[PDB]
Amino acid sequence: SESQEDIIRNIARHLAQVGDSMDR
Amino acid sequence: SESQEDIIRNIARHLAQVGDSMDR
Amino acid sequence: GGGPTSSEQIMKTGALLLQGFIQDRAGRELALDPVPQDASTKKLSESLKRIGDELDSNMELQRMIAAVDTDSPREVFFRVAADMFSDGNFNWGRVVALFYFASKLVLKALSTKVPELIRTIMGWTLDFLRERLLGWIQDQGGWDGLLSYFGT
Amino acid sequence: GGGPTSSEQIMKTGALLLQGFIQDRAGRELALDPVPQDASTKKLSESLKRIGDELDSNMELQRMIAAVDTDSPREVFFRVAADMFSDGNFNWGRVVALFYFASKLVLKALSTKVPELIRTIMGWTLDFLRERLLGWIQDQGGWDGLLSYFGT
């Protein structure tokens, strides 16, 4: 729940980071 | 429909036949 | 208490073999917790698996099975089951064949479910994209901009 | 009419790429009718596929994705989508990552569906077996009789 909210934010930040890095 | 009834009887007879043959 | 001949043991073991068997064939990621069982039941699982494998190489059967419509799969299951045993005979091969048919309905239902899931999820994704990303994508000159991005 | 920069072409191509991409990963029988497309769109599909493959070898991501609960998968999808683009930035990699996330929700929903289908179909099968076959099975002395039948 409160921890699931944490896992979700996590997934997001990670996806965003992986996407920022797909450039070079 | 009427042909689906035919496909169903078919599957049955085949399954029954395969099962009768699994012996030897 | 109750030996192999008891109705309880028959239903209990029956459940195990059938689940073992269906899960096995439905695995061929996201896999399934295997069914824990004793030595004799493993020996049985093993043999069912082999008979099922041999049934999969029966092209007649696979053709007809794929041909059948599973809009109402319960109706189909009971109609086939009844027809298979209607001549009043019983043997182990028909029981095996019945189990095999059950595993194929699972796969068949799964197949109809896949494009449904996809369409639903695509709906969410394209809704998000249109309302949140479309502006930026246009700024790139559309998907032709992704070509440039990949180097092509 | 309308070039690559039109909203129509963006939604249209977007649908194709996304469906192509999700179907591709969900294939890894009962397969899917591939998405017919032009040369440029195939080139794009090809590249998406490669980026997705490279994402699959990111163990951090796969761990967290499997960790997340998809009881309400729409909620999850929109929460992740919003969070990913909340800092106001856009680039192609995030769009690709979003598509990747969409394909993983498909697989994840599918995974929860499998044991449901199995239980339902086992219900029918064990109901048939108990009412129609149990007598005969007892006559064999239970499933120990299937052992004999297989030779073991």
Side-chain angles (χ1 to χ4, degrees), chain D residues 1-50 52-152:
Chain D
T5 305
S6 77
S7 61
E8 302 70 9
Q9 199 49 66
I10 289 161
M11 297 312 300
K12 225 192 65 179
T13 301
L16 292 183
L17 297 178
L18 184 58
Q19 177 155 85
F21 181 78
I22 293 176
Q23 291 190 352
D24 199 307
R25 323 210 71 77
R28 308 204 190 102
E29 312 178 3
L30 261 149
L32 306 147
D33 278 334
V35 189
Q37 46 197 12
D38 62 51
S40 267
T41 306
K42 282 173 184 181
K43 275 179 163 185
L44 273 192
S45 276
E46 180 188 62
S47 292
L48 282 179
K49 186 214 144 195
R50 286 179 279 198
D53 276 23
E54 296 171 2
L55 291 206
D56 286 323
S57 71
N58 186 313
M59 293 323 300
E60 281 197 283
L61 197 58
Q62 269 78 239
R63 187 155 308 115
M64 273 179 320
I65 295 183
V68 80
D69 174 47
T70 64
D71 287 343
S72 278
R74 214 191 87 110
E75 271 187 304
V76 173
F77 176 79
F78 283 94
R79 220 171 301 270
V80 175
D83 280 349
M84 279 177 74
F85 291 96
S86 62
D87 65 355
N89 293 323
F90 303 98
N91 54 59
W92 283 118
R94 287 180 181 192
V95 172
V96 177
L98 177 70
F99 275 21
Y100 179 80
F101 185 63
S103 79
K104 304 294 278 205
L105 283 170
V106 168
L107 307 179
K108 223 159 166 301
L110 249 204
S111 96
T112 73
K113 241 294 179 191
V114 167
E116 288 186 331
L117 281 180
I118 289 179
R119 181 180 320 109
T120 292
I121 286 175
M122 277 183 54
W124 305 339
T125 307
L126 295 170
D127 194 24
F128 182 83
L129 185 144
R130 182 170 158 118
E131 305 312 318
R132 296 290 311 273
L133 309 174
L134 193 314
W136 178 84
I137 292 169
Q138 280 193 313
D139 278 358
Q140 317 307 125
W143 296 96
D144 272 11
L146 185 50
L147 275 169
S148 303
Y149 173 88
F150 281 134
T152 300

Side-chain angles (χ1 to χ4, degrees), chain C residues 1-50 52-152:
Chain C
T5 305
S6 77
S7 61
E8 302 70 9
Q9 199 49 66
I10 289 161
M11 297 312 300
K12 225 192 65 179
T13 301
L16 292 183
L17 297 178
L18 184 58
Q19 177 155 85
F21 181 78
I22 293 176
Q23 291 190 352
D24 199 307
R25 323 210 71 77
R28 308 204 190 102
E29 312 178 3
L30 261 149
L32 306 147
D33 278 334
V35 189
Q37 46 197 12
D38 62 51
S40 267
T41 306
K42 282 173 184 181
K43 275 179 163 185
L44 273 192
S45 276
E46 180 188 62
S47 292
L48 282 179
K49 186 214 144 195
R50 286 179 279 198
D53 276 23
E54 296 171 2
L55 291 206
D56 286 323
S57 71
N58 186 313
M59 293 323 300
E60 281 197 283
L61 197 58
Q62 269 78 239
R63 187 155 308 115
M64 273 179 320
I65 295 183
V68 80
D69 174 47
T70 64
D71 287 343
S72 278
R74 214 191 87 110
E75 271 187 304
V76 173
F77 176 79
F78 283 94
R79 220 171 301 270
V80 175
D83 280 349
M84 279 177 74
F85 291 96
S86 62
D87 65 355
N89 293 323
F90 303 98
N91 54 59
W92 283 118
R94 287 180 181 192
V95 172
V96 177
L98 177 70
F99 275 21
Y100 179 80
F101 185 63
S103 79
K104 304 294 278 205
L105 283 170
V106 168
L107 307 179
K108 223 159 166 301
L110 249 204
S111 96
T112 73
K113 241 294 179 191
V114 167
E116 288 186 331
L117 281 180
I118 289 179
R119 181 180 320 109
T120 292
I121 286 175
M122 277 183 54
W124 305 339
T125 307
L126 295 170
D127 194 24
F128 182 83
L129 185 144
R130 182 170 158 118
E131 305 312 318
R132 296 290 311 273
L133 309 174
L134 193 314
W136 178 84
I137 292 169
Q138 280 193 313
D139 278 358
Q140 317 307 125
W143 296 96
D144 272 11
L146 185 50
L147 275 169
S148 303
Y149 173 88
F150 281 134
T152 300

